[PDB]
Design an enzyme around this catalytic site. Structure first.
Site, PDB file in Angstrom:
ATOM      1  N   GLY A 196       0.808  -1.198   0.000  1.00  0.00           N
ATOM      2  CA  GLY A 196       0.000   0.000   0.000  1.00  0.00           C
ATOM      3  C   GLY A 196       0.849   1.258   0.000  1.00  0.00           C
ATOM      4  N   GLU A 239       7.032  -5.177   6.653  1.00  0.00           N
ATOM      5  CA  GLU A 239       6.314  -4.245   7.509  1.00  0.00           C
ATOM      6  C   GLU A 239       6.952  -4.092   8.881  1.00  0.00           C
ATOM      7  OE1 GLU A 239       2.138  -4.580   7.157  1.00  0.00           O
ATOM      8  OE2 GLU A 239       2.196  -6.260   5.746  1.00  0.00           O
ATOM      9  N   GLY A 286      -0.195  -4.711   0.892  1.00  0.00           N
ATOM     10  CA  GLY A 286      -1.559  -4.837   0.409  1.00  0.00           C
ATOM     11  C   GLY A 286      -1.731  -5.915  -0.641  1.00  0.00           C
ATOM     12  N   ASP A 300       0.051  -6.536   8.264  1.00  0.00           N
ATOM     13  CA  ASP A 300      -1.108  -5.651   8.294  1.00  0.00           C
ATOM     14  C   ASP A 300      -2.420  -6.422   8.221  1.00  0.00           C
ATOM     15  OD1 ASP A 300      -2.450  -3.023   8.139  1.00  0.00           O
ATOM     16  OD2 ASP A 300      -2.878  -3.618   6.071  1.00  0.00           O
TER      17      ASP A 300
END
Ligand SMILES: [K+]
Ligand SMILES: [K+]
Ligand SMILES: [K+]
Ligand SMILES: [K+]
Ligand SMILES: [Mg+2]
Ligand SMILES: [Mg+2]
Ligand SMILES: [Mg+2]
Ligand SMILES: [Mg+2]
Ligand SMILES: [Mg+2]
Ligand SMILES: [Mg+2]
Ligand SMILES: [Mg+2]
Ligand SMILES: [Mg+2]
Ligand SMILES: [Mg+2]
Ligand SMILES: [Mg+2]
Lengths: 232, 128, 467, 50, 53, 160, 190, 75
Positions: free
Chosen positions: C81, C155, C132, C163
């Site tokens: 993302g 991440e 994402g 996430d």
RNA sequence: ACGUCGAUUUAUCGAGUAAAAUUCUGUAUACAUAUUGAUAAUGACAAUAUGUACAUUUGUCUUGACUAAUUACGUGCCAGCAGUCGCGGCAAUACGUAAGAGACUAGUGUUAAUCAUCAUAAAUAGGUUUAAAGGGUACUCAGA
RNA sequence: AUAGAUGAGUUUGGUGAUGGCUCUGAUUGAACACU
């Protein structure tokens, strides 16, 4: 098909006249067509006249014939409904085979189908003779108490008859307002008023008043009906 | 034919088809009166054989045509006023008209029992 | 959610490119191509608001029978993302922080829809898939990897945590591979994504256009169960398999795989690193001194808060449902926008892209955090100011409904040994014929037996090792 | 147009329709060919398309 | 009344179910009908003059 | 002009009769408007303007064409992806109605009658599968899309 | 049961696989009857060519053609040859065909139209027998070019098998083909 | 001719289910498969008695029923 | 009227519920009364309503196929039939009689004409290699 | 006005076409014949 019993005809008469219930409620109650309930009352009213005028009824012919036809006694013993009270006329526009291309995920409802057949066509939800039944069924889906849904049905039908009786009242009242009754020595002249300018854009109009000038006599044409068309 | 060719009037009427009875079809008449000029016999065409009773009639209009005498036996001869109607003898060339048997001078078959109306014959009048 | 309720919920907001996504509809196929190659098809709000209405709309049609999602370029499928944009918004007061919180709502709302989708959902991982991009794939019954596939969840390096759906997919993964891929942020390339279990099939990048033309022909009957529909597509994806490489061996297998199960079984990061140090130290019987030493260098270069927080959800994630997972991750990720690590890591490694030096985490090292401290508690307490996520539907499940189309893992080999008395080689053939010749079954099954099986009654019987 | 018309790519469609209803109305259809359910979910591929 | 009704339909929004179920046509193809003059027309004419000479 | 629409109608028939996967068309505003209408009806698969050679099949819709200036306008060309289903083309017939020799125009009262299988004017009723395209002020619409918008106009072609 | 002691239906009893009493319940009709002749070294040989349609009356129809020196042997051939060539003919609401169809057989073009319920079989005599035997009740047909007794039947029988399938047309375009009449009355009204 | 419509179906459904599938309706398995499984499939949503043919042919001589001399004989 | 006639296998098939007979009705119409066409007044002639009363004809075409409907006898490419194809040359379902059958009916057939059949002058909507029909040629004003 | 669109006989040793003729439908300010 079965025929209403001699007693059943009284149950319908005693219900609309004495209890003053609307014809629609009596039709839905006994599953009898509104056109038949109205006719049974008319025929029963004539019997009251004959009995009032001391006229001999055809009782021997009635009893013998009623034993040759199947019957459906109404009231407690309701084994089956008399007939279908929700018969809709097959409009010629709705008889066409139409496969309208629409998106793959469209919710095509009866309203959308009416517009496909024509822009002035109504769905079957509005062509019923007792359109209050739909609203009555919509209350049961919400699990509304039964006899409470019956209360709303009576008020709905009872209110619908008032509107109809109110419309025809104003109509008949407006039809006699255009007539000027002038009494004379022998007859009573009835002068009716009308807009003489409503003859269409070229003089040709179905609802125009007069004897059309440019027509010869059709009495020599084949299939020229010369019999009274309407006994009013 | 393009649209421009149809504007200039390329769609003309089809050629006329000769009528069966031109003398009657021309003036829109169902029948015509005439005086017989000759009463003779005509020979049928290739397949058929026999003798067809024909009469050369001069119609009131002026034209001379060859009519056919239906039925068995006739009483018309030179200078006879007979009525003419359309039709034709399919096996006789030139014979394109018939003669009504209940006409002015032509008498209907006297011994006819079937289809009397076609031959102008009154009912036998036996039980009458 | 109805059409109108979706049209007014995903209204285009200002700044939304009109052609972020490219949708196509063939006979039976509905494709979704992420058209943003200049940025490696990085997911953003504009791109999510276009997919959610379509998916909800195709779910109401009996014509759409196979959904496909893919990238545009030849390098990336969905490279995470737009977390860089969220960093700026987080530094604009409390209201500017709630903008990012609402972004995760759209993402989780979409990824939940994909997980509980009522139609076959395929995903072409033809390119790098991170962040994402992992949320649109892992929850699908079919995840096709290729030579260009590159899977990773970087991440923990930006101060964030796994996430979307990683707290549901990684925990219930064969062995402790889940926590490893999450904490260490490993990098799997090519067929390694197929052996690990992330991908279900493995095709070449060039045979994908031919697969779509075939998927459009499949016309299922309206009375077929969802199972049959997935079986028909599974058999079709296997017709285009050109075979796995001949020299490429299982990366996480044998020694390394065993080491992961011996160093990622505890609930404390201190114990995990302690175990790795033993493996790293020469003389250990594991024989992975090279891998262990490299792993430690990667763990000591990430936010210690994310490590404690990440490992915490791996043990709890095994007890949550997929629907409850997203809701908790919403509250979980909402507290990261307020933290200092996330705002520091993103600004230091993405916005500055290696400038100004490495990210400075608030706790410089794990040793600083005393043993008794529990910094993982705050990130699992839902706050009132953040409303609970309102998912688009009400479906949920504790275990994946259809996740058996990939290579057989330890779970499938175990049960197969308890229901029967297969031998060493006779057991391998059982999976081969049962799998109809799926590429890599002989190597995958053999690896499982080499690790979690022994020669119990000589050649005839084969039982597990843990007694 | 000399060549004959090959309908081999529609054997399932044609054969399935012939088995939906029985010639003798009012009776249930007889069992279909044993291959009708074998290729149920394996449709042909698009051919004759340059 | 008949005018507003007709004018309202001829300028109505597209059906939502028909916007979410239609393949995307790139705006570079469905709206770029204008053909502007070549911005490099002058530079090309000068280069073409040298080649022809 | 309308001559381009007639050449386009006949070409798409010959292309589908030859079972061609791709086909080219002159790049004109009129042709594009009818092509978009056919696409909006589901008869063709793709629309893309490019050079005299077709774009890459795998990335057809992703193909980003170059700007259309006066230096390459003469070479531009529209590439439409044809559709075939069940051993039959989806765009079998494209019989035109308005020809250069005569431009047939229809009224809203006639389109309402033709949309339900009843002749009106120089048109004939539509049957199952048939589709009629009308050029109106709101673009090249479908006869049923023009009935909801209450407009008539030039009748271009009839698709079976 | 003594119905077929001539042995004519025995072979047909195997192909079709149904009782002899059921083969007699079919609606058979001799539509065409030609008198063809062939010149040989031994003079003319005159044969009778007969086409017979066999129909169940509820969506099954078959066309059979045969010839022989005797007019009786030719009718039996086509009868058995027509009962084994039966095919399911799709029909909208069991009363009419789907949409319009136009077939050409060597100069004989036939055009069939689907008409609303109650329209009737306003068709020629040969099309009336086929429709009446297949189960069709409302239809209109026109012969555009030629009226050959034989090619008119081949074209008509070929048009009933070339009806536009609404479900295939839908999957081809990716759009529904909602039938308005079924939604208006909430179900098909046969 | 007329068509009978019960208000129960009108209240619950609005005619959308009749268009599910590809427009004609959701397809159902063939007859040679239903009873093969001991469990029958769910009932199809529609009005009761909505697949019976209507006898239009018998209405050829309906206009005669309107005369006054015929109506007396039918009563 | 447990009669009559027609055929014919002499005992079968029809005329035949047909008739007679019995029981009712009072239609067109006749007569009578009232009203009405007209009102300030004027009714040439008739309509309408009510009451009573009466049960009165068959005729014509067709019958090989198109086209619903059959035998017998006579005639023998003769006499004749015929809208189209056609029929008749010594055992004619086609001509002429007799009977039967099919159908319309105070009308029924025939002749003449018009529309449709006929996309058979095709604007909607045709066609021109071998079947009616591409001009000897293409430069070209007008015009499309 | 949304029910309104239909064929048949006849060319050839024979088949398939082309193409006329006639019949089937409705009608007349009609005439004639038998009634
Ligand atoms: K001749
Ligand atoms: K890609
Ligand atoms: K012809
Ligand atoms: K020439
Ligand atoms: Mg007689
Ligand atoms: Mg009287
Ligand atoms: Mg006959
Ligand atoms: Mg005669
Ligand atoms: Mg001849
Ligand atoms: Mg005779
Ligand atoms: Mg009279
Ligand atoms: Mg010359
Ligand atoms: Mg010359
Ligand atoms: Mg010859």
């Amino acid at each position: 098909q079965p025929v209403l019993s001699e007693g059943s005809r009284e149950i319908i008469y005693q219900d609309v006249m004495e209890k003053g219930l609307p014809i629609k409620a009596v039709s839905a109650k006994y599953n009898v067509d509104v056109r038949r309930v109205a006719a049974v009352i008319r025929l029963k009213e004539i019997e009251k006249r004959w009995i009032k005028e001391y006229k001999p009824l055809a009782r021997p012919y009635a009893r013998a014939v009623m034993k040759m036809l199947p019957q459906t006694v109404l009231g407690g013993p309701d084994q089956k409904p008399h007939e279908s009270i929700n018969d809709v006329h097959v409009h010629s526009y709705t008889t066409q085979q139409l496969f309208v291309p629409v998106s793959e995920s469209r919710e095509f409802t009866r309203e959308d189908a009416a517009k496909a057949f024509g822009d002035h066509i109504l769905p079957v939800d509005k062509k019923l003779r007792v359109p209050e039944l739909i609203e009555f069924q919509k209350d049961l889906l919400k699990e509304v108490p039964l006899q409470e849904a019956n209360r709303k049905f009576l008020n709905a039908t009872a209110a619908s008859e008032a509107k109809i009786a109110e419309r025809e009242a104003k109509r008949r009242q407006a039809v006699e307002d255009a007539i000027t009754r002038v009494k004379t020595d022998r007859f009573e002249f009835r002068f009716q008023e009308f807009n003489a300018e409503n003859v269409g854009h070229d003089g040709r109009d179905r609802n125009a008043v007069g004897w059309r000038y440019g027509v010869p006599f059709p009495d020599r044409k084949r299939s020229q009906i010369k019999i009274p068309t309407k006994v009013e | 034919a393009t649209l421009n060719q149809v504007m200039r009037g390329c769609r003309k009427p089809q050629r006329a088809r000769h009528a069966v009875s031109p003398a009657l079809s021309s003036i829109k008449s169902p029948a015509l009166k005439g005086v017989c000029v000759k009463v003779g016999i005509t020979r049928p065409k290739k397949p058929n054989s026999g003798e067809r009773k024909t009469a050369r009639v001069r119609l009131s209009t002026g034209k001379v045509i060859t009519a056919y005498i239906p039925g068995e036996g006739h009483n018309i001869s030179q200078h006879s006023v007979v009525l003419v109607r359309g039709g034709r003898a399919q096996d006789c060339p030139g014979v394109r008209y018939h003669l009504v048997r209940g006409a002015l001078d032509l008498a209907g078959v006297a011994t006819r029992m079937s289809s009397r109306s076609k031959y102008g014959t009154k009912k036998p009048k036996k039980a009458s | 959610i109805s059409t109108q309720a979706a049209a007014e919920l995903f209204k285009p907001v200002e700044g939304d490119e009109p052609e972020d996504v490219l949708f196509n509809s063939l006979y039976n196929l509905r494709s979704v191509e992420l058209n943003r190659p200049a940025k490696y098809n990085a997911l953003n709000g504009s791109m999510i608001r276009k997919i959610a209405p379509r998916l909800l709309e195709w779910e109401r049609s009996d014509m759409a029978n196979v959904i496909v999602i893919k990238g545009s370029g030849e390098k990336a499928f969905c490279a995470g993302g737009d977390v860089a944009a969220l960093a700026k918004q987080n530094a604009e007061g409390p209201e500017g922080v709630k903008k990012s919180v609402d972004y995760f709502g759209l993402e989780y709302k979409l990824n939940h829809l994909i997980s509980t989708y009522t139609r076959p959902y395929v995903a072409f991982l033809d390119g790098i898939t991170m962040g994402g991009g992992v949320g649109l794939s892992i929850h699908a019954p079919f995840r096709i990897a290729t030579e260009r596939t590159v899977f990773a969840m970087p991440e923990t390096k930006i101060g964030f945590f796994p996430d979307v759906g990683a707290s549901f997919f990684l925990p219930r993964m064969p062995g402790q591979v889940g926590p490893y891929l999450g904490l260490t942020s490993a990098l799997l390339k090519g067929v390694q994504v197929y052996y690990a279990g992330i991908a279900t099939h493995y095709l070449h990048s060039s045979s994908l256009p031919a697969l779509e033309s075939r998927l459009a022909e499949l016309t299922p009957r309206d009375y077929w169960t969802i199972e049959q529909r997935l079986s028909v597509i599974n058999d079709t994806i296997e017709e285009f398999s050109t075979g796995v490489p001949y020299d490429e061996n299982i990366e996480i297998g044998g020694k390394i795989r065993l080491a992961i199960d011996r160093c990622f079984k505890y609930d404390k990061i201190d114990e995990i690193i302690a175990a790795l140090k033993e493996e790293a130290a020469e003389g250990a019987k594991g024989g992975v001194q090279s891998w262990a030493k490299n792993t430690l260098e990667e763990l000591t270069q990430r936010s210690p808060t994310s490590l404690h927080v990440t490992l915490r959800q791996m043990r709890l994630g095994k007890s949550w449902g997929i629907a409850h997972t997203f809701k908790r991750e919403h509250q979980m990720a909402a507290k990261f926008m307020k933290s200092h690590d996330f705002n520091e890591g993103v600004t230091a490694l993405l916005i500055d892209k290696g400038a100004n030096g490495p990210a400075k985490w608030k706790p410089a090292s794990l040793d600083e955090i005393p043993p008794g401290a529990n910094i993982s508690e705050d990130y699992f307490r839902n706050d009132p100011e953040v409303p609970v996520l309102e998912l688009l539907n009400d479906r949920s499940y504790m275990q994946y409904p259809y996740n058996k189309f990939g290579l057989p893992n330890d779970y499938d080999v175990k049960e197969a040994i308890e229901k029967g008395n297969f031998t060493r080689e006779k057991l391998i053939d059982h999976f081969v014929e049962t799998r109809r010749g799926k590429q890599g079954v002989r190597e995958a099954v053999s690896d499982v037996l080499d690790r979690m099986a022994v020669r119990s009654k000589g050649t005839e019987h084969v039982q597990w090792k843990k007694e | 147009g000399k060549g004959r018309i090959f309908q081999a790519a529609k054997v399932y469609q044609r054969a399935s329709e012939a088995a939906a209803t029985n010639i003798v109305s009012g009776l249930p259809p007889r069992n279909p060919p044993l291959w009708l359910k074998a290729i149920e979910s394996i449709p042909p591929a698009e051919i004759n398309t340059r | 009344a008949r005018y507003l009704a007709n004018k309202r339909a001829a300028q109505a929004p597209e059906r939502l179910d028909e916007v979410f179920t239609r393949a995307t046509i790139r705006e570079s193809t469905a709206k770029n009908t204008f053909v502007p003059l070549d911005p490099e027309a002058f530079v090309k004419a000068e280069e073409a003059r040298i080649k022809h000479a | 002009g309308i001559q381009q629409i007639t050449n386009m109608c006949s070409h798409l028939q010959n292309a589908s009769r030859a079972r061609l996967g791709l086909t080219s068309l002159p790049n004109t505003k009129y042709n594009l408007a009818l092509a978009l209408a056919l696409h909006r009806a589901g008869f063709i698969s793709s629309i893309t303007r490019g050079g005299p050679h077709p774009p890459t099949p795998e990335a057809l819709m992703t193909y980003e064409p170059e700007p259309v200036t006066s230096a390459n306008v003469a070479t531009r060309r529209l590439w439409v992806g044809l559709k075939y289903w069940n051993e039959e083309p989806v765009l079998k017939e494209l019989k035109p109605i308005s020809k250069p020799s005569r431009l047939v125009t229809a009224s809203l009262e006639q389109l309402n009658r033709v949309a339900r299988g009843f002749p009106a004017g120089y048109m004939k009723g539509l049957q199952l599968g048939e589709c009629l395209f009308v050029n109106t002020d709101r673009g090249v619409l479908e006869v049923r899309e023009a009935v909801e918008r209450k407009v008539g106009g030039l009748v271009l072609c009839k698709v079976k | 049961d003594g119905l077929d002691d001539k042995g004519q239906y025995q072979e047909l009893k195997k192909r079709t696989g149904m009782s002899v009493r059921q083969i007699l319940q079919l609606k058979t009709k001799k539509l065409v009857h030609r008198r063809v002749v062939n010149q040989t070294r031994l003079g003319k040989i005159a044969s009778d060519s007969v086409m017979v349609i066999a129909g169940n009356g509820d969506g099954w129809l078959g066309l059979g053609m045969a010839k022989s020196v005797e007019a009786s042997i030719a009718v039996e051939k086509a009868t058995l040859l027509a009962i084994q060539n039966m095919q399911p003919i799709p029909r909208y609401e069991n009363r009419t065909i789907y949409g319009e169809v136009t077939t050409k057989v060597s100069g004989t073009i036939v055009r069939l139209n689907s008409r609303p319920p109650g329209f009737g079989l306003r068709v020629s005599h040969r099309i009336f027998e086929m429709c009446r035997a297949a189960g069709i009740r409302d239809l209109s047909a026109k012969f555009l070019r030629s009226r050959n007794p034989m090619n008119t039947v081949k074209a008509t029988y070929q048009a009933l098998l070339s009806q536009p399938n609404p479900e295939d047309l839908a999957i081809g375009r990716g759009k529904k083909l909602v039938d308005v009449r079924k939604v208006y009355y909430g179900g098909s009204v046969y | 001719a007329v068509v009978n419509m019960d208000p129960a179906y009108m209240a619950k459904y609005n005619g959308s289910e009749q268009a599910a599938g590809r427009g004609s309706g959701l397809s159902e398995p063939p007859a040679y498969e239903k009873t093969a499984d001991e469990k029958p499939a769910k009932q199809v949503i529609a009005n009761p008695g909505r697949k019976v043919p209507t006898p239009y042919e018998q209405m050829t001589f309906a206009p005669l029923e309107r005369r006054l001399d015929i109506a007396i004989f039918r009563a």
